[PDB]
């Protein structure tokens, strides 16, 4: 939901 790009 927020920025979950690693």
């Amino acid at each position, epitope marked *: 939901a927020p920025d979950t*790009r*690693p």
Partner: single-chain antibody
Amino acid sequence: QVQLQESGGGLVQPGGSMKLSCVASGFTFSNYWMNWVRQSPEKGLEWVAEIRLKSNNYATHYAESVKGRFTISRDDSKSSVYLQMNNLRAEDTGIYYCTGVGQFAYWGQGTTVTVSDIVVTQESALTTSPGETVTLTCRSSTGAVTTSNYANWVQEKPDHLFTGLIGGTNNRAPGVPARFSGSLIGDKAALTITGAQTEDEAIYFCALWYSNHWVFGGGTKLTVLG
């Protein structure tokens, strides 16, 4: 090393306007959402705004306190993020930081701006000693913290130096020491230091996500004695 560098702060009159800038290097800026967060002695850390990607039509969200007064924007060709602040109020006084990645790994040094409901609760203070295991907790007034709150943990050292430790509940940021870990325990988010070290004496903040905004806890002062 990633670098974020804010600029544009100053000493302004209420009703005034100011634009802050932040330039990023060392990571693929255009693939990450960017945030502004401010620190005041009165209100601790407060999330201000986010801006998402080109593929999201640069969607933005704002704290209720700044909505209609502030505008976040970015320029991917310059690896920069901006905060335009209009109709400044005394309560806007603070140190402003640009931050992002997984979700608050990286923080700039901050730029000072002097103008002249969900509650997230943390332990005010904890005392430990080197080699002990210490667990800090983060509670929401809404009920249970779950993986849908994407808990983050950030450390503040002197002088207003922030580094993200954990994002997405339990994911360590790159280069963060192995002794730090994140968990959910009894419906709270929790940061554990397994074998505390003297250099871990710091203030630790948690942040929780609620659909389209973040709410930071009040911070815990951790003292490491001996």
